[PDB]
Amino acid sequence: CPLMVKVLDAVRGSPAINVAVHVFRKAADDTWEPFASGKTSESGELHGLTTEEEFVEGIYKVEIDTKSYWKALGISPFHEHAEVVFTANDSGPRRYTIAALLSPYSYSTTAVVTN
Amino acid sequence: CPLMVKVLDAVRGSPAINVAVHVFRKAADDTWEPFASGKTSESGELHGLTTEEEFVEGIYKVEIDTKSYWKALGISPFHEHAEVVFTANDSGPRRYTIAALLSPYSYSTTAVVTNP
Amino acid sequence: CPLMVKVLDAVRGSPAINVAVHVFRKAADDTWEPFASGKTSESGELHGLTTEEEFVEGIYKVEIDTKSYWKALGISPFHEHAEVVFTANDSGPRRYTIAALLSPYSYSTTAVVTNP
Amino acid sequence: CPLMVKVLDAVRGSPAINVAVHVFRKAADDTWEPFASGKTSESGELHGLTTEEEFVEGIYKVEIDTKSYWKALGISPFHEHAEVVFTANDSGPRRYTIAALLSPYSYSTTAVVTN
Ligand SMILES: COc1ccc2c(c1)c(CC(=O)O)c(C)n2C(=O)c1ccc(Cl)cc1
Ligand SMILES: COc1ccc2c(c1)c(CC(=O)O)c(C)n2C(=O)c1ccc(Cl)cc1
Numbered sequence: 132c133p134l135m136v137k138v139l140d141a142v143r144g145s146p147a148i149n150v151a152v153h154v155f156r157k158a159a160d161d162t163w164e165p166f167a168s169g170k171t172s173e174s175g176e177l178h179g180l181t182t183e184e185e186f187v188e189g190i191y192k193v194e195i196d197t198k199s200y201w202k203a204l205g206i207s208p209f210h211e212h213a214e215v216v217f218t219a220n221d222s223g224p225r226r227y228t229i230a231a232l233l234s235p236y237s238y239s240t241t242a243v244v245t246n
Numbered sequence: 247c248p249l250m251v252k253v254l255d256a257v258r259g260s261p262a263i264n265v266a267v268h269v270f271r272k273a274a275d276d277t278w279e280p281f282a283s284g285k286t287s288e289s290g291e292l293h294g295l296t297t298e299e300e301f302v303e304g305i306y307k308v309e310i311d312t313k314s315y316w317k318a319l320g321i322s323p324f325h326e327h328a329e330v331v332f333t334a335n336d337s338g339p340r341r342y343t344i345a346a347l348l349s350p351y352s353y354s355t356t357a358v359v360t361n362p
Numbered sequence: 363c364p365l366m367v368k369v370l371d372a373v374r375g376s377p378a379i380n381v382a383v384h385v386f387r388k389a390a391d392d393t394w395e396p397f398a399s400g401k402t403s404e405s406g407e408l409h410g411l412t413t414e415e416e417f418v419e420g421i422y423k424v425e426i427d428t429k430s431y432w433k434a435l436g437i438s439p440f441h442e443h444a445e446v447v448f449t450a451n452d453s454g455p456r457r458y459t460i461a462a463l464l465s466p467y468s469y470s471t472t473a474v475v476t477n478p
Numbered sequence: 479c480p481l482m483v484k485v486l487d488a489v490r491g492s493p494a495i496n497v498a499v500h501v502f503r504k505a506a507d508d509t510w511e512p513f514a515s516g517k518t519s520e521s522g523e524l525h526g527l528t529t530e531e532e533f534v535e536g537i538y539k540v541e542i543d544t545k546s547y548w549k550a551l552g553i554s555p556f557h558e559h560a561e562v563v564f565t566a567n568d569s570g571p572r573r574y575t576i577a578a579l580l581s582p583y584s585y586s587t588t589a590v591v592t593n
Pocket of ligand 1: 237
């Protein structure tokens with residue numbers, strides 16, 4: 132699993148569950164091509180988005196539908212989403228965990244890139 | 247000054263200076279139309295992006311060029327940018343302070359929204 | 363004004379107003395001696411905690427009463443406080459902006475340190 | 479495992495490995511009593527700090543030696559540490575993950591409290 136998304140809820144101190152996540156790869160014409168998507172699990176995790184063969188070097192956008200999440204909880208969100216855009220660079224072997232910590236008017240995102 | 251961007255460097259504990267910031271507004275055809283852009287000052291602040299008149303309702307995207315920032319400091323960062331997308335002025339005009347806190351492999355973005 | 367505290371509410375996208383902030387300085391006997399305290403203003407800022415003369419080298423602890431803040435807003439928060447401990451003025455006097463961003467179950471604390 | 483500490487490095491995008499973590503419980507005389515400690519693993523995780531029998535309701539301080547971590551990497555840190563102070567409240571069953579995201583001049587901490 133070369134790309135994992137973890138989403139947490141800083142309001143309730145919980146995994147952010149059932150959050151729609153879309154992954155896009157930047158196409159040669161500079162447009163975002165849908166690549167993978169899912170909903171975060173009960174652990175606020177989204178596994179199996181892609182495989183190592185599919186996850187080639189490129190620019191990726193991870194779009195987390197944070198707004199729908201906050202709408203489900205009845206809390207007015209600021210952001211339309213959380214958009215995590217990064218270069219997957221092959222180098223040595225790598226696994227990407229895109230973590231998002233969500234608040235209504237704030238999100239933080241971090242990459243954990245490991246061997 | 248209804249839209250301000252404040253960028254901080256979490257490695258140096260300083261304002262993130264001369265960070266390029268691009269603001270786009272979602273057009274009727276769902277494309278991102280260039281709305282405004284600028285550089286953060288020495289205080290890591292970007293003022294005068296827009297006006298009360300120009301800053302109408304819409305979905306705005308603030309794209310903060312964090313990559314070029316980190317690269318100029320000799321760091322290869324993870325993200326291409328910090329990018330804040332939001333509906334502005336849905337309940338009437340508000341003042342928006344978009345703050346980004348930057349680390350090479352992480353950023354947070356927060357909004358202070360106030361009613362003038 | 364060598365020490366400023368800025369508290370933001372990440373739920374409301376607003377300054378965190380009337381947040382009690384206690385500053386302690388580590389004494390020679392390793393105890394935390396009360397150094398200064400105050401409330402954040404309407405802008406979520408706390409100015410005038412100390413002076414250049416008073417704010418000597420040391421290890422300082424800034425304790426932000428986030429719990430009472432969230433409780434007054436009807437939220438039972440996780441943390442008792444946001445609490446920033448740091449060595450101040452080791453390389454000579456600096457200006458410190460301690461910023462805290464608050465969510466009921468999370469906070470970030472950042473320092474902007476500048477040379478006057 | 480009723481209390482888990484996870485520490486990440488926002489500079490290198492990695493688990494924060496070998497970070498000393500001390501857990502304290504507030505004693506009746508209002509002093510911090512050492513309760514548990516460890517060093518974060520290769521996954522930046524600290525498991526087995528306590529047991530459900532030991533982890534009674536109370537006020538806990540999780541102190542993360544962030545400064546030593548940054549000193550090891552040769553990066554000048556702002557904070558002496560990251561001090562996470564919270565009330566463990568029994569309620570229904572609970573597991574506490576104290577996560578810290580570390581930058582030299584910034585730390586964020588989040589609680590993930592689950593069943
Ligand atoms: C006026 O609104 C803000 C917002 C955030 C601020 C600040 C001011 C100042 C200082 C000031 O301008 O007074 C600092 C040091 N801030 C941060 O540390 C910070 C925290 C979270 C994020 Cl996501 C981004 C930046
Ligand atoms: C429930 O347990 C957590 C909590 C946070 C986590 C992770 C796992 C992983 C999983 C991993 O990559 O190992 C990443 C990347 N997390 C973060 O980004 C993060 C976000 C906010 C804070 Cl305050 C601290 C850390």
